[PDB]
């Protein structure tokens, strides 16, 4: 199910946040990561040597904590007989924390999504840069790879390199050694060749579409001999599939050895898609400001109020914004209020005396708003669109507009 996946993602997002905060001594921690193809015995060998080398660590505290961490991960890996699909991510150590509580910790988990990243590390802290970098780039792209020998279909997350399907074909010869039949056989050869493009286009609709709306944010053709060009511009190719064709790559080799060549060439263009979608959205937001219209909002004072009321349609947000939701509380009367505060208005603020009664109004701890938006945009109006500061329209939205805005469901009036 889709809802169960989103909960599993949120579970891991929460877990990840707690592990980055961890902190520990010298280099007592372990950050270990295993790809899905990998063998566990080879990893269990690696840890056994790392255990051996650790035996000659001079400083006491570090040494004994390391070895015990290496023994724990070794024993966790004994439980699995194979590295599961999606890889494995093992996070051992002995974390320091409040109450002087030097406690041992182990978190092995097969992550959601497949991961193509290996990593062995020890350090004072854990290293979840791989996992968070994955979680950001959910964007899948498709890769159709045509060749006169035979086709290939596969997909490509920021990390992971998949193979969906492939076939090989018994295509005819170039020439016909009769005068009269040359022309007929050449037409016949071109009809076999067109049927091959049709099959590839049909299989492409079979694979890349999902509920009559394609899952892949793009799609790449990669080939030679103007065979990708035959597929790209043909009326056979379904337009819902064709409109997401971003690159037609020229590759040496074919199939899966050509695949990873096609990815290396297609890198800049596949990175630029997020930047293009940003521009398109903030460009759509800015047109409403350019005209009268009035189907827009900006500032946490307004944008939230708009979301509370007659809701927004899209809620644009800058990653970095730093504005945070505190929960203020009274000592005697038990009165409370929540406010969305800037970095200086949250760090130190003499505002929060209760005044009317005459007491100190204690600011009970926060959470910070990009996270709050994600928590319950579903219970408002939705399409929480994270944007960056890279684009010229985005740069204005971040620097000028405070990195927060929205495209509204209808016209709205505002005062004060």
């Amino acid at each position: 199910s889709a809802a169960d996946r989103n909960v599993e993602i949120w579970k891991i997002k929460k877990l990840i946040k707690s592990l980055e905060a961890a902190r520990g001594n010298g280099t007592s921690m372990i950050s270990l990561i295993i790809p899905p193809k990998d063998q566990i015995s080879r990893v269990a060998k690696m840890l056994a040597d790392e255990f051996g080398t650790a035996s000659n660590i001079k400083s006491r505290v570090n040494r004994l904590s390391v070895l015990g961490a290496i023994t724990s991960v070794q024993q966790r890996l004994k439980l699995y007989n194979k590295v599961p699909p999606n890889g494995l991510v093992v996070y051992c150590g002995t974390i320091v924390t409040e109450e002087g509580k030097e406690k041992k910790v182990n978190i092995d988990f097969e992550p959601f999504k497949p991961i193509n990243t290996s990593l062995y590390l020890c350090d004072n802290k854990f290293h979840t840069e791989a996992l968070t970098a994955l979680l950001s780039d959910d964007s899948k792209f498709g890769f159709i790879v045509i060749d006169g020998s035979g086709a290939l279909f596969g997909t490509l997350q920021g990390n992971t390199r998949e193979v969906l399907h492939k076939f090989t074909v018994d295509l005819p010869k170039k020439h016909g050694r009769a005068a009269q039949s040359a022309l007929r056989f050449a037409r016949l050869r071109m009809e076999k060749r067109h049927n091959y493009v049709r099959k590839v286009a049909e299989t492409a609709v079979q694979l890349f579409i999902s509920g009559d709306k394609v899952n892949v944010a793009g799609l790449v053709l990669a080939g030679s001999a103007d065979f990708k060009t035959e597929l790209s511009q043909s009326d056979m190719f379904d337009q819902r599939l064709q409109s997401k064709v971003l690159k037609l790559v020229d590759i040496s080799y074919g199939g899966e050895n050509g695949f990873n060549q096609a990815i290396e060439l297609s890198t800049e263009v596949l990175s630029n898609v997020k930047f293009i979608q940003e521009k398109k959205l903030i460009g759509r937001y800015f047109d409403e400001i350019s005209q009268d219209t009035g189907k827009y909002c900006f500032g946490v004072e307004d944008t939230l109020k708009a979301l509370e009321m007659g809701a927004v349609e899209i809620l644009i947000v800058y990653e970095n914004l730093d504005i945070m939701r505190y929960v203020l509380h009274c000592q005697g009367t038990e009165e409370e209020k929540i406010l969305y505060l800037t970095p200086e208005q949250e760090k130190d603020k003499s505002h929060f005396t209760d005044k009317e009664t005459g007491q100190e109004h204690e600011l009970i701890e926060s959470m910070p708003l990009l996270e709050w938006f994600a928590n319950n945009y579903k219970k408002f109006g939705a399409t929480l669109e994270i944007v960056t500061d890279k684009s010229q329209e985005g740069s204005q939205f971040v620097k000028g507009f405070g990195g927060i805005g929205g495209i509204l469901r209808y016209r709205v009036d505002f005062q004060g």
Binding site: I289, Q396, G400, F401, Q415
Partner: protein, 194 residues
């Protein structure tokens, strides 16, 4: 290389009737920066063109239509001869007057034409974008303005202007045409000019 210029038309800008407005619509000020400044009291709604984005929200909002944000090339910021106030007109050059050679100014009005003539006449001091005569001459060096201004500031050259509005002169001077010309005789060339 481009920058904004903020302008407020002081004839139209009344801060009291409209309230603030600009502040309430500004995404610079709704964030919380000192882009626009008015208050309920105090005349002329001030803007900083630095802190301003140039989004044109406040111009649409101001109820009288007092405001304007026009963009100028950033080349011109170096070469300011006169800007009277913040949120005001900004002249960038003066013509290059030559002695015994009739200077031909041509170009539409409201483009610092009167200000230029007043500066060359020597009523106005080139505030030079600041809002000082050795500093002004040093700005205008290698050029015929330093020749022109030196001349002005020790040899008191007589500034006389044929006015734009001709219909305002009758309601000021009195007597015959012949009487006024006799009074203003310095050259004593009534007949030949007549």
């Amino acid at each position: 290389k481009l920058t904004r210029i903020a302008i407020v038309n002081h004839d139209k800008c009344k801060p009291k009737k409209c309230r603030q407005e600009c502040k309430k619509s500004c995404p610079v000020v709704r964030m919380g920066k000192l882009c626009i400044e008015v208050t309920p009291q105090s005349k002329i709604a001030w803007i900083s063109e630095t802190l301003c984005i140039g989004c044109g929200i406040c111009i649409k909002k101001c109820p009288f239509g007092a405001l304007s944000i026009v963009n100028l090339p950033s080349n011109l910021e170096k070469e300011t001869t006169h800007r009277y106030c913040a949120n005001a007109f900004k002249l960038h050059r003066l013509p290059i007057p030559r002695p015994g050679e009739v200077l031909g100014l041509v170009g539409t009005n409201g483009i610092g034409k009167s200000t230029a003539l007043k500066i060359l006449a020597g009523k106005q001091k080139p505030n030079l974008g600041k809002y000082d005569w050795q500093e002004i001459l040093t700005y205008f060096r290698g050029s015929e303005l330093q020749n022109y201004f030196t001349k002005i500031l020790e040899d008191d050259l007589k500034a006389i202007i044929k006015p734009q509005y001709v219909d305002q002169i009758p309601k000021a001077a009195k007597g015959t045409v012949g009487s006024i010309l006799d009074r203003k005789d310095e050259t004593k060339t009534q007949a030949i000019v007549c």
